[PDB]
mmCIF file of C-alpha atoms and ligand atoms in Angstrom:
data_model
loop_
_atom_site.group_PDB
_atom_site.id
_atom_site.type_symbol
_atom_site.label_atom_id
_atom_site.label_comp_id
_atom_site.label_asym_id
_atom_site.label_seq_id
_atom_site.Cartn_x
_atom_site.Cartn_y
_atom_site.Cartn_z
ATOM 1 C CA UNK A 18 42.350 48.674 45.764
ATOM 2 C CA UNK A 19 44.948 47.664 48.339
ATOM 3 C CA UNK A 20 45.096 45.223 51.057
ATOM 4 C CA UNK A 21 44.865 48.397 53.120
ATOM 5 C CA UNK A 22 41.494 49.627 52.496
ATOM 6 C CA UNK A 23 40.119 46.011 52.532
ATOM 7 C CA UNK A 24 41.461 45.684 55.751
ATOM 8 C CA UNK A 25 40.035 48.928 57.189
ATOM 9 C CA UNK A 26 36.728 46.923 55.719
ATOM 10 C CA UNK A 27 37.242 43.866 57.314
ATOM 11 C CA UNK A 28 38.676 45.570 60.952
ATOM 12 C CA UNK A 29 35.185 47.755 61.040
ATOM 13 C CA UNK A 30 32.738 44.808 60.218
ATOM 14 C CA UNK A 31 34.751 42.918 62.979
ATOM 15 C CA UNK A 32 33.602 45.815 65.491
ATOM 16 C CA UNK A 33 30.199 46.382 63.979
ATOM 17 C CA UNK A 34 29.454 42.656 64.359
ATOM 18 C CA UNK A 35 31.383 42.474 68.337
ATOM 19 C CA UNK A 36 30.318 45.971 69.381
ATOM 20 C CA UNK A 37 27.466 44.815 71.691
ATOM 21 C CA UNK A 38 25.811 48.070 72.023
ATOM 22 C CA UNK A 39 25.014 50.241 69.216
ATOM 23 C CA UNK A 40 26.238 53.443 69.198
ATOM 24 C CA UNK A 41 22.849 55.048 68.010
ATOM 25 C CA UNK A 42 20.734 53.418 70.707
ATOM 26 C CA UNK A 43 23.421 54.554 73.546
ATOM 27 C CA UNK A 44 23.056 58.368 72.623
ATOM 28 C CA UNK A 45 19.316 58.049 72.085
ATOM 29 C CA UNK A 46 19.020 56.269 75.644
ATOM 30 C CA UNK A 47 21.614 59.361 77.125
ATOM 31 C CA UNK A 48 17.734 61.147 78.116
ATOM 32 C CA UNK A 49 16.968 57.551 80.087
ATOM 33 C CA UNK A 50 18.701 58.538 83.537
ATOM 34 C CA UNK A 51 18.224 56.138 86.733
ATOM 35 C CA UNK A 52 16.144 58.024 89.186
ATOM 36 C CA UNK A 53 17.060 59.268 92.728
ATOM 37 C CA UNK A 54 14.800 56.149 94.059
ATOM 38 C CA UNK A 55 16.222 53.847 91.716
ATOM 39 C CA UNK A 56 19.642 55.145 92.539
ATOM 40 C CA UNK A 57 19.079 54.154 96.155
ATOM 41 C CA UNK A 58 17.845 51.026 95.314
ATOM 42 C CA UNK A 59 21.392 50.294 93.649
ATOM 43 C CA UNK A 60 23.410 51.526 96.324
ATOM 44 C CA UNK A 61 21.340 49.594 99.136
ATOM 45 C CA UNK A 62 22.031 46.784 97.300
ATOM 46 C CA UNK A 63 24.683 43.609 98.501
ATOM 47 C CA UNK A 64 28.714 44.253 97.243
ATOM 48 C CA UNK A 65 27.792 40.811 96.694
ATOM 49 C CA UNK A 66 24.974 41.407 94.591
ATOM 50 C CA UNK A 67 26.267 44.013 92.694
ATOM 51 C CA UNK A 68 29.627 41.965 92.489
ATOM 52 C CA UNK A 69 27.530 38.911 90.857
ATOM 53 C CA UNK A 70 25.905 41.740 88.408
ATOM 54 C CA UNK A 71 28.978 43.596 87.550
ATOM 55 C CA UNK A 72 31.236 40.600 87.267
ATOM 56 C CA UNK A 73 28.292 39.313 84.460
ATOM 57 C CA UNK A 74 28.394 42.194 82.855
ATOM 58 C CA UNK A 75 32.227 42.395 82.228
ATOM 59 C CA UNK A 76 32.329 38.813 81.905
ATOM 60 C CA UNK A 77 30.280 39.357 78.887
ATOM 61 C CA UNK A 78 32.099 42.165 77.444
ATOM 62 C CA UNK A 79 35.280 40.633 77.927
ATOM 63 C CA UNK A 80 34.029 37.903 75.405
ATOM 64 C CA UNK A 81 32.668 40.449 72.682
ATOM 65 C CA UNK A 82 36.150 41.780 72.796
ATOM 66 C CA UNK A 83 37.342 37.801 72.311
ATOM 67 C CA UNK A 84 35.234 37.624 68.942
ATOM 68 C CA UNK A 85 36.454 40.675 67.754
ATOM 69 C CA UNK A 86 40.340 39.568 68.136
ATOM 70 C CA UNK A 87 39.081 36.648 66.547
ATOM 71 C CA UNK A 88 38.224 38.673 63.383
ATOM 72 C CA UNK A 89 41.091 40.498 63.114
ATOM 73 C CA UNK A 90 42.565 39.298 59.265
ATOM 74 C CA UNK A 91 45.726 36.938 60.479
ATOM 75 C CA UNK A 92 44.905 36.567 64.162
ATOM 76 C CA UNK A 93 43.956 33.179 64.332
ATOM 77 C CA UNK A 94 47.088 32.048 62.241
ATOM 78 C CA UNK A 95 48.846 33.572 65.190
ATOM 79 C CA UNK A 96 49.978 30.557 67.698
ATOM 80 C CA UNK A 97 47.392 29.464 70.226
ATOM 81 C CA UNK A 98 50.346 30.628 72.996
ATOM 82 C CA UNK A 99 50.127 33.998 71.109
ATOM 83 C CA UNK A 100 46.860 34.653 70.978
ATOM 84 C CA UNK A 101 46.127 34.045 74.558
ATOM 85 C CA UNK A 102 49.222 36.763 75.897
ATOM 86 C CA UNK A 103 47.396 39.321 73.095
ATOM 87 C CA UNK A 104 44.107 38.476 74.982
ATOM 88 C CA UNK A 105 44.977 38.245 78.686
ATOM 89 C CA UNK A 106 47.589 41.756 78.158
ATOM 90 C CA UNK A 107 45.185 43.494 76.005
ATOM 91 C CA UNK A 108 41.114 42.427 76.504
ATOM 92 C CA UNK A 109 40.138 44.475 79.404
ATOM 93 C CA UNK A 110 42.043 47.201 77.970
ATOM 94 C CA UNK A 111 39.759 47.275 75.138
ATOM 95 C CA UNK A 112 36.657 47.171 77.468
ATOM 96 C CA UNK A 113 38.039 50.291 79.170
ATOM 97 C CA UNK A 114 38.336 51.790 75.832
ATOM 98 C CA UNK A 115 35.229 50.920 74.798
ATOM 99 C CA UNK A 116 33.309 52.113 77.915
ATOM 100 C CA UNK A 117 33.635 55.866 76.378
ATOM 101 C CA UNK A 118 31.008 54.852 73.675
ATOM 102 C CA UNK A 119 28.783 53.874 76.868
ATOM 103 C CA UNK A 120 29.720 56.921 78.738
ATOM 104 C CA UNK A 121 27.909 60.751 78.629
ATOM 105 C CA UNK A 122 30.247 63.582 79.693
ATOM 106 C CA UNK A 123 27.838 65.833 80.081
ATOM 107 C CA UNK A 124 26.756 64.358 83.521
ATOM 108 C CA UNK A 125 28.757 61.636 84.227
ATOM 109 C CA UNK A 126 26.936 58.848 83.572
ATOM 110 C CA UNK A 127 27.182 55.486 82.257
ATOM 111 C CA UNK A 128 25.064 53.081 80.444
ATOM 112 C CA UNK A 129 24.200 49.993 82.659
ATOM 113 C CA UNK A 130 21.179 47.422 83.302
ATOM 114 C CA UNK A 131 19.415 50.056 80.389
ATOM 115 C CA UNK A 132 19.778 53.763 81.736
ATOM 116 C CA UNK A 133 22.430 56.053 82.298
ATOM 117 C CA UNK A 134 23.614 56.046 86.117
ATOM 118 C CA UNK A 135 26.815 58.113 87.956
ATOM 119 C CA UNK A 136 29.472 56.495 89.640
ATOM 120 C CA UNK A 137 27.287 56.348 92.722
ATOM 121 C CA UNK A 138 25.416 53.587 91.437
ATOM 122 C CA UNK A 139 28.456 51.437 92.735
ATOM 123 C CA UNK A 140 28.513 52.732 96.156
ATOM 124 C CA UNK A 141 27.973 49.240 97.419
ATOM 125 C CA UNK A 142 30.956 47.970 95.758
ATOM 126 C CA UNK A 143 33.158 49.967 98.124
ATOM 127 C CA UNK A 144 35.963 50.632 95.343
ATOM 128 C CA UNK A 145 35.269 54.880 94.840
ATOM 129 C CA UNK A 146 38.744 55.419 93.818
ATOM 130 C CA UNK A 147 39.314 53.120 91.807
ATOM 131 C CA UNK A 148 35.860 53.351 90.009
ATOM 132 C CA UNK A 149 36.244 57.061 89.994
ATOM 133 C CA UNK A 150 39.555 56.786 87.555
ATOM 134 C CA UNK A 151 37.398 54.613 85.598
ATOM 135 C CA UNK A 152 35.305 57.190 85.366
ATOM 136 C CA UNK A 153 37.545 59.854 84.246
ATOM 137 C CA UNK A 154 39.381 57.797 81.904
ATOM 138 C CA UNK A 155 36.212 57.586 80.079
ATOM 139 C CA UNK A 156 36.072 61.254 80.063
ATOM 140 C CA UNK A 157 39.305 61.799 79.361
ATOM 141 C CA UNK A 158 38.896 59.836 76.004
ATOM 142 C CA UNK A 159 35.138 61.485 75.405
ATOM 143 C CA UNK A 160 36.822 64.301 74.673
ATOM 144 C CA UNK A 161 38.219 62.827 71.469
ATOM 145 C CA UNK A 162 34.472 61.696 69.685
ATOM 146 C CA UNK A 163 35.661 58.495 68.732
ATOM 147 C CA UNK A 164 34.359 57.635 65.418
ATOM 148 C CA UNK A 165 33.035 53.840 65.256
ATOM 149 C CA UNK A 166 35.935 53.073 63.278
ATOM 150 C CA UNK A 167 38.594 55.098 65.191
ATOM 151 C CA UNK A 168 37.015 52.605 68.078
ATOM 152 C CA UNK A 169 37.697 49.507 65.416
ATOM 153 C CA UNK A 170 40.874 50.498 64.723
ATOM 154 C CA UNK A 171 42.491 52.070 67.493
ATOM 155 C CA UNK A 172 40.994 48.947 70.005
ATOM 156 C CA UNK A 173 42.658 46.235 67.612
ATOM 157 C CA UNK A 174 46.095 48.314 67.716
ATOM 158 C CA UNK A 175 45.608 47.855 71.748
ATOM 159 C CA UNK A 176 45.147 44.173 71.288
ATOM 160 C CA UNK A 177 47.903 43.833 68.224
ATOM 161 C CA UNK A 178 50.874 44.409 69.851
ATOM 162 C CA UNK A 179 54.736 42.352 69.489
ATOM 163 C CA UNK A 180 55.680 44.094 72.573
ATOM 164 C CA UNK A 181 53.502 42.435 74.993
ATOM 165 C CA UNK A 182 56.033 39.842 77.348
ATOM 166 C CA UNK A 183 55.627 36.415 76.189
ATOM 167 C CA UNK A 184 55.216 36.082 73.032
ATOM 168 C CA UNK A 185 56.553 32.891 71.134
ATOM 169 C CA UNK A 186 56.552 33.979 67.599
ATOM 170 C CA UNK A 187 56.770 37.995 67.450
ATOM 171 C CA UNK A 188 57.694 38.431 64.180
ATOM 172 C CA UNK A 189 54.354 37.170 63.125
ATOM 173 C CA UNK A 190 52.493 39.641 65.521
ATOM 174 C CA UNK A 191 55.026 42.602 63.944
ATOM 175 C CA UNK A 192 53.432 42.149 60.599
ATOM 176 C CA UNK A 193 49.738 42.517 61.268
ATOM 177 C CA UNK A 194 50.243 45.096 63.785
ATOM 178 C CA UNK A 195 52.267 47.053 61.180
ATOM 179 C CA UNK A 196 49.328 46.544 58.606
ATOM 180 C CA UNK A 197 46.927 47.701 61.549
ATOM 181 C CA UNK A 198 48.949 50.747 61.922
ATOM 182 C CA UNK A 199 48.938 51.436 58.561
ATOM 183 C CA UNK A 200 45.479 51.259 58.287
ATOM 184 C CA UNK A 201 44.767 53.354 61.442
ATOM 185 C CA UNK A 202 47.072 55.997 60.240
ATOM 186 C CA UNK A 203 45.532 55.978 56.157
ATOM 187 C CA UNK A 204 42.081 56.432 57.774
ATOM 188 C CA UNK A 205 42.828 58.790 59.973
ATOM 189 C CA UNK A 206 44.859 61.184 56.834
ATOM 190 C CA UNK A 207 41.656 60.119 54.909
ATOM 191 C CA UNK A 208 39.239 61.581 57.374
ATOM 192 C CA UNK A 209 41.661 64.611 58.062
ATOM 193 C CA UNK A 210 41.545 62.922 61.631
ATOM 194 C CA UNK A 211 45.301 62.859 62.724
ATOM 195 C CA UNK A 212 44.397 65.653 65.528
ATOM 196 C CA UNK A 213 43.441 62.454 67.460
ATOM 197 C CA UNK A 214 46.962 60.873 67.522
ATOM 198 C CA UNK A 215 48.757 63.559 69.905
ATOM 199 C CA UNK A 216 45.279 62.898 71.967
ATOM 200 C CA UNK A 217 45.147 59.357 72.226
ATOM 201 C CA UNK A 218 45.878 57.999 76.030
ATOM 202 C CA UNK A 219 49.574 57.281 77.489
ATOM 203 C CA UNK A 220 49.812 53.318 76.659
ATOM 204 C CA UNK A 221 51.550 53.388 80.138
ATOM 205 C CA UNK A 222 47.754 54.556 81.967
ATOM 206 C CA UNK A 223 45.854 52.267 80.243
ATOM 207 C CA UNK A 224 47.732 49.529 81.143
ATOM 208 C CA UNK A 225 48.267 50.933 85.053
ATOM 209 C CA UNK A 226 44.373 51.384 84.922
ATOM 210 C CA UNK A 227 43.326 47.972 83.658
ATOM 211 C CA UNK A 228 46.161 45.997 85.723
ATOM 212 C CA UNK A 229 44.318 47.771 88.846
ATOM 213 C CA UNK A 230 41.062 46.988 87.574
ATOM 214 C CA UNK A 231 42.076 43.201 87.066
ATOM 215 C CA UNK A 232 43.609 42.957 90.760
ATOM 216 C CA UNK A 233 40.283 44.220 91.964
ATOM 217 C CA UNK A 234 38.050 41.794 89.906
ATOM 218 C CA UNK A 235 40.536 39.275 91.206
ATOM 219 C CA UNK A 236 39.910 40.043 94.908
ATOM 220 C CA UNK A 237 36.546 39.711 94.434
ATOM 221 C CA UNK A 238 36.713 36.351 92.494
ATOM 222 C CA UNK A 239 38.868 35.396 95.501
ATOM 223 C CA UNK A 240 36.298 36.307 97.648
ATOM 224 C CA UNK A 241 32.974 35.381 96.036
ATOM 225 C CA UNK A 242 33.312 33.074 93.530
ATOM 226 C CA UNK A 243 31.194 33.637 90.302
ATOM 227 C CA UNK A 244 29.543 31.366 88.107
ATOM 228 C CA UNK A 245 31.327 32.503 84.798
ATOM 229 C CA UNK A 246 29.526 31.837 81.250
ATOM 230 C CA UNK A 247 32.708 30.303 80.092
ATOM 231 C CA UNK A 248 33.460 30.415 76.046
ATOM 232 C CA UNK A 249 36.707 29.863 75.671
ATOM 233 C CA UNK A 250 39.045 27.952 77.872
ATOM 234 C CA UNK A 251 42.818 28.618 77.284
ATOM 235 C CA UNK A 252 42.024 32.279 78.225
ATOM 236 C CA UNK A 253 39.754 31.617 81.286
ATOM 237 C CA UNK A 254 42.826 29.094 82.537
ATOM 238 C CA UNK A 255 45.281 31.874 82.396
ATOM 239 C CA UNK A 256 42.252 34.318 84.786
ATOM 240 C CA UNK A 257 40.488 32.070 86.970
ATOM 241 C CA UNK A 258 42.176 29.695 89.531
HETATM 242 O O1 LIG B 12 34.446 32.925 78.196
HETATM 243 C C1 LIG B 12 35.587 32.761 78.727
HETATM 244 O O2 LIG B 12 36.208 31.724 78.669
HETATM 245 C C2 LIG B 12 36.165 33.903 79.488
HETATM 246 C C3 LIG B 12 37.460 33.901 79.999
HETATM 247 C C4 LIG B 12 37.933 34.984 80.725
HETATM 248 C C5 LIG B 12 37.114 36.106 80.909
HETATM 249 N N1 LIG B 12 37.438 37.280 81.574
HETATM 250 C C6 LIG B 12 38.413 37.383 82.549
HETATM 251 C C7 LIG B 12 38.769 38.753 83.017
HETATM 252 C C8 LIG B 12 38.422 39.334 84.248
HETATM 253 C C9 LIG B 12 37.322 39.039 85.182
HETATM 254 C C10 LIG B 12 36.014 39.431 84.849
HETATM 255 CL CL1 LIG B 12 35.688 40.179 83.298
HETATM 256 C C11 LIG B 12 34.961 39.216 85.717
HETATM 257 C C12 LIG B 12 35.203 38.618 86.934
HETATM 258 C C13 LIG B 12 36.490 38.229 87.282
HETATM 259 C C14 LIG B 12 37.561 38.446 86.424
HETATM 260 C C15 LIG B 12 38.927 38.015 86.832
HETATM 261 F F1 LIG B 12 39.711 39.047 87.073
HETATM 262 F F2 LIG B 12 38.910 37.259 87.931
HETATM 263 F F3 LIG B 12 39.540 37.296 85.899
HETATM 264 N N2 LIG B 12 39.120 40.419 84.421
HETATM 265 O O3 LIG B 12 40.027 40.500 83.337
HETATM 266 C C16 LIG B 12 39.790 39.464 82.513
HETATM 267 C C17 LIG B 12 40.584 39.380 81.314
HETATM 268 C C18 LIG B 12 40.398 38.558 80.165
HETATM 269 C C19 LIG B 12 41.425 38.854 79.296
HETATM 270 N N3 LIG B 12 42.197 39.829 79.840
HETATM 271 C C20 LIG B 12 41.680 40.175 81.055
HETATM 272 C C21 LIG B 12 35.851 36.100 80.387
HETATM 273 C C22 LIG B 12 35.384 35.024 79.695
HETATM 274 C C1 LIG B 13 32.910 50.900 86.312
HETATM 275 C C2 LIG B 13 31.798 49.912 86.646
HETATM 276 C C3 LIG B 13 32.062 49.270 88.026
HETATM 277 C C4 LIG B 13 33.340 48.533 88.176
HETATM 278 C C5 LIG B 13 33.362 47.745 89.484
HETATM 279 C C6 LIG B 13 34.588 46.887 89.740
HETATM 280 C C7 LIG B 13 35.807 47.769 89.952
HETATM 281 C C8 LIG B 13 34.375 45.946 90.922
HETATM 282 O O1 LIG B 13 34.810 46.099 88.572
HETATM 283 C C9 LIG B 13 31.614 48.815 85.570
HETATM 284 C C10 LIG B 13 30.547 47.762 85.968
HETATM 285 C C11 LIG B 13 29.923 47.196 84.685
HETATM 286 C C12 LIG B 13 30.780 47.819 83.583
HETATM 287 C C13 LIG B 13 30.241 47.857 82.159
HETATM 288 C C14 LIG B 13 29.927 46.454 81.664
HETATM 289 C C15 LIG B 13 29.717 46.418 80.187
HETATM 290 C C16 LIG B 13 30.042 47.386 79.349
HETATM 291 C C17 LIG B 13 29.725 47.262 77.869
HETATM 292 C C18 LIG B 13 30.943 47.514 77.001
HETATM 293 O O2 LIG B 13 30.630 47.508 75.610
HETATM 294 C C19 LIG B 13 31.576 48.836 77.334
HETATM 295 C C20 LIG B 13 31.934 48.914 78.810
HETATM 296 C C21 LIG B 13 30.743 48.664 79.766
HETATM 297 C C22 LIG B 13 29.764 49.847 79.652
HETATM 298 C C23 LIG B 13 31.277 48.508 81.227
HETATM 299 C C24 LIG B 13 31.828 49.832 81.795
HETATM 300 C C25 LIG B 13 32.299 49.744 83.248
HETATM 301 C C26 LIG B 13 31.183 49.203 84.133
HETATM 302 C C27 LIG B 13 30.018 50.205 84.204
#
């Protein structure tokens, strides 16, 4: 076999062991909807409250999306400069992308704190536009049923890239991105999946969407500090001040 298929192998264990939730358990739960009471309950909430929550929550997937770069066959031969532009450019991104899993198109509704809610859960939060492209960027890229390893594959192409500003030793980042492609692309003709390449976001909104997202966290930061369960401190330097 080649070093290709092994590293389709190695790229999905990465994600199965850094997905967080299990696909399986999130459609089973799609049934498990927050109530009108408990919806109310949410949105009379604190934007500090929710803030503290939220900021946990992403906090958290954030690092899952750490482990998983630090899986990735090569990545942590990459230069510790390297590895932290990769991260900072590319983490969140991921966590957008892999929101969809979490997400049911049918109504709306996200998985959070165990059942599926709308994006009136947040009201407290005071950020309906910019939650609401959140929103329909996750149903924008439902549309595509992601395979698990499309996820795997496509999320550590987002994360894999030698254009990203920065970097110190790009040549090294060229070569496992181009094996990443070629993997991505060999599963894809495998699985007669190549439909999904013409489908798959603009890398230009993805990046508009998460640099928005990040100013916003930011503000909040600025405003209400959080207590942050911190892993992994090159990469909270370059995001916390
Ligand atoms: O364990 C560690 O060391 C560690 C280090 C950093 C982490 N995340 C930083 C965040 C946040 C963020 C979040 Cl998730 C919540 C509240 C406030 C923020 C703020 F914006 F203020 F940074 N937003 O984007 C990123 C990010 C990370 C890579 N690219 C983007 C998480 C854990
Ligand atoms: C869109 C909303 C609100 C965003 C509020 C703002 C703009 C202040 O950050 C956020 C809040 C919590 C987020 C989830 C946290 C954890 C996960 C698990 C991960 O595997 C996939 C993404 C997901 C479901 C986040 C989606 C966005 C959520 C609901």
């Amino acid at each position: 076999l080649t070093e290709i298929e092994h590293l389709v192998q190695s790229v999905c264990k990465s994600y199965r062991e850094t997905c967080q939730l299990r696909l399986e358990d999130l459609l089973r739960q799609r049934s498990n909807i927050f109530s009108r009471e408990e919806v109310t309950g949410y949105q009379r909430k604190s934007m500090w409250e929710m803030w503290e929550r939220c900021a946990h929550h992403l906090t958290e997937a954030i690092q899952y999306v750490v482990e998983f770069a630090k899986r990735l066959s090569g990545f942590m031969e990459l230069c510790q400069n390297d590895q932290i532009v990769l991260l900072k450019a590319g983490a969140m991104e991921v966590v957008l992308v892999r929101m969809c899993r979490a997400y049911n198109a049918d109504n709306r509704t996200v998985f959070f704190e165990g059942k599926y809610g709308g994006m009136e859960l947040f009201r407290a939060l005071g950020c309906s536009e910019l939650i609401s492209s959140i929103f329909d960027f996750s149903h924008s890229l439902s549309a595509l049923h992601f395979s698990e390893d499309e996820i795997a594959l496509y999320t550590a192409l987002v994360l894999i890239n030698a254009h990203r500003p920065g970097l110190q030793e790009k040549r090294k980042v060229e070569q496992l991105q181009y094996n990443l492609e070629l993997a991505f692309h060999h599963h894809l003709h495998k699985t007669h999946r190549q439909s999904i390449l013409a489908k798959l976001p603009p890398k230009g909104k993805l990046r508009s969407l998460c640099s928005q997202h990040v100013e916003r966290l930011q503000i909040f930061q600025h405003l209400h500090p959080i207590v942050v369960q911190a892993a992994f401190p090159p990469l909270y330097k370059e995001l916390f001040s």
